[PDB]
Design a binder for these strands. Sequence first.
DNA 1: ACGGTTTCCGCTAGAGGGCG
DNA 2: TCGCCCTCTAGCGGAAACCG
Length: 139
Amino acid sequence: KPFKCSMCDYASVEVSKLKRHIRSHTGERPFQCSLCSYASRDTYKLKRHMRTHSGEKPYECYICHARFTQSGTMKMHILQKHTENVAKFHCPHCDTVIARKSDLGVHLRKQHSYIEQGKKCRYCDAVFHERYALIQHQK
DNA sequence: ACGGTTTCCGCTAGAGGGCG
DNA sequence: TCGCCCTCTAGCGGAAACCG
Ligand SMILES: [Zn+2]
Ligand SMILES: [Zn+2]
Ligand SMILES: [Zn+2]
Ligand SMILES: [Zn+2]
Ligand SMILES: [Zn+2]
């Protein structure tokens, strides 16, 4: 409506939007950096990748003047540093509270995901394949 | 106190959406 | 239209902070 994707269920109004989405399915990265071996699927992510080469920090916190490469990083810094009563991330499986969303993801794969490279309990010889079960068992 | 682990914090880079 | 630019999202890795 008008342009449905055919593999996944994406659809959007513009032909360029559906073709860019299909580049996400195929893996085509048309726009090559003229400086290194990076290549992007659209023009914007290449322009933004060029800031790493130039080393520019075009965003500045209007409160403490720290500088940042991207706006989202600046916004988040303002949120964690110059703002109170902000919602935190409580893990569903344990009692852990984390300030940032992706750190919660890091926590979930690192403490609550299966690893066949299991660890032995420090005090007995039983082995566990998820760290939280291990540390809880180690009572 | 001391090493390991957990959380912080700026970083790169991945998607989709609005509009002139 | 579609090229431009925007936010939101996902993870990385060094540093700091926390703990048994
Ligand atoms: Zn698709
Ligand atoms: Zn490059
Ligand atoms: Zn600031
Ligand atoms: Zn947890
Ligand atoms: Zn045991």
